């Protein structure tokens, strides 16, 4: 399950999902699957140095449902 994902697994998931530029944020902060899935909406929108449009989709269509 995604709670077991490594940082590299998180980067792969978001690259495959069409967010390659945003995937580098998870690499830069070494965010593994457990940490990814705990991220709150405001954390995704304001704490990753990514654009808001992608960030909204990353949270609502990925983190919330993984």
């Amino acid at each position: 399950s995604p709670v077991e994902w490594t940082v590299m697994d998180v980067v792969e998931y978001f690259t495959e999902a069409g967010f390659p530029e945003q995937a580098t944020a998870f690499q830069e902060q070494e965010i593994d699957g457990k940490s990814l899935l705990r991220m709150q909406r405001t954390d995704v929108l304001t704490g990753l140095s990514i654009r808001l449009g992608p960030a909204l989709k990353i949270y609502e269509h990925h983190i919330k449902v993984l």
Binding site: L45, R51, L52, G53, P54, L56, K57, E60
Partner: protein, 71 residues
């Protein structure tokens, strides 16, 4: 023609057509807020994250609500 398929430019141009929001399309464009992302936003996002005043934020969110109801 559902807002879910609108481009980032379409969202920005729509916002600029709202009274008092002419200055605010640019931030939506730079943040790559296309129609799909636009429908995920709240008034709090517009005020607190985008630093847009309550008045224009309310007009934008009222548009979002209308667009969502039409999906």
């Amino acid at each position: 023609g559902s807002v879910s398929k609108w481009s980032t430019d379409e969202v920005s141009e729509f916002i600029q057509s709202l009274p008092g929001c002419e200055e605010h399309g640019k931030v939506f464009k730079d943040e790559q807020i296309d129609g799909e992302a636009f429908l995920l936003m709240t008034q709090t996002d517009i005020v607190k994250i985008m630093s847009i005043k309550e008045g224009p934020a309310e007009k934008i969110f009222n548009s979002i609500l209308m667009f969502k109801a039409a999906e």
